[PDB]
Amino acid sequence: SKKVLLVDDSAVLRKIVSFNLKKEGYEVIEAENGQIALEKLSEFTPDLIVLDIMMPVMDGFTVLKKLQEKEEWKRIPVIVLTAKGGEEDESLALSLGARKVMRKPFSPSQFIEEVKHLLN
Amino acid sequence: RLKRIDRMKTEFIANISHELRTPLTAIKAYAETIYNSLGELDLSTLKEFLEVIIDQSNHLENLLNELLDFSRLERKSLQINREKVDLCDLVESAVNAIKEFASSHNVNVLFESNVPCPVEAYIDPTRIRQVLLNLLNNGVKYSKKDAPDKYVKVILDEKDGGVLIIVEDNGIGIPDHAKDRIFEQFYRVDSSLTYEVPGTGLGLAITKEIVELHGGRIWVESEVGKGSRFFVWIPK
Ligand SMILES: Nc1ncnc2c1ncn2[C@@H]1O[C@H](COP(=O)(O)OP(=O)(O)O)[C@@H](O)[C@H]1O
Ligand SMILES: [Mg+2]
């Protein structure tokens, strides 16, 4: 029933995060890059977005930025899940509207705890 | 005495971290999922997940062999060992090893010989396979974003009492100021078109040192946005 837009350029990463999300009964739509993600928002409005930073075509900082430029989007919570480990990368993502930033490698169980907290 | 930058060393360190982090993210997430989901995995998905762990370990191992190989060449402790080999099976073997990585990026990989096979040469097969793999790898990593006809091709020929191996791609190409530097240790072109591509900048320095240990040379030709040709000449 709850719908998550999962945005990452690694198929390997998407598979494992989609597996843990569907374990909870969530529905998953995949985007391979940030532009594809923004195009998917015309088909639907997800209850949550899981967002990578480093992606070809359109990165995650740019996604976050544009998400704040439409009003239907600007309110969908976003959890950023990224190999980017700097405090300044985190601050920037938060300043751009992300609700939470988690750094890869990640614990799948901690990640699902945080996904739940944003969906409740 | 001007050789290198300490800043290049700082970027290198950061890059190793970044490149190793990706397969490690997969290993840890897949392993912990299996551990916490035994009742929720069917057998084909359990085996699938274990095969991801294994395949991501193998990628990581390769990245570690690159660091090692480089330190060895650097301290001139890597002595090559030559023998007659058929480069046509060598090149086909290398194209084979790269198919998975390549289709994951929708890159087609071809092999044409201008001369009839086998093309026989006195080379270290292991070290020359490593040269071919770094060029094919590069052709995939640096291929165009969003294109339906992406390719890397190996073209083999016999020239100048030697073998001439060209690896051609239709990828992003290399700006002219960069052609003089790409073979140097730690050097990576830094552009909005390489931001998400991982690497250390060791690949082509290792390739070049290996080619030179055979008394051969490697050079490049490229057009920004058209693609590139790496030329490897080795004596027979
Ligand atoms: N086929 C290619 N097309 C475009 N750029 C390339 C290609 N091969 C190599 N390069 C560039 O040369 C740089 C150095 O290559 P290499 O030494 O293999 O390092 P890495 O792949 O770890 O950066 C790359 O970062 C990239 O900028
Ligand atoms: Mg990414």
Author numbering:
A (entry chain C): 2 to 121
B (entry chain A): 243 to 478
Authors' account:
TCS are composed of two main players, a sensor protein called histidine kinase (HK) and an effector protein called response regulator (RR). The HK catalytic core is comprised of an ATP-binding domain (CA domain) and a phosphoacceptor domain containing the phosphorylatable His residue (DHp domain). Thus, we have explored the relation between the effect of the pH and His rotamer-dependent phosphorylation from a functional and structural perspective solving the structure of several HK853–RR468 complexes at different pHs.
Crystals at each pH diffracted X-rays at good resolution (~2.0 to 2.85 Å) and all of them contained, in the asymmetric unit, a symmetric dimer of HK853 bound to two molecules of RR468. Our structural data on HK853–RR468 complexes at different pH do not support this model since gauche− rotamers are observed independently of the pH, even at neutral pH 7.5 where the pH-gated model favored the trans rotamer. This comparison revealed that all the structures, independently of the pH, showed higher similarity with the phosphatase-competent HK853–RR4685.6 than with HK853–RR4685.0 (RMSD values ~0.7 vs. ~2.0 Å for the superposition of ~707 residues, respectively).
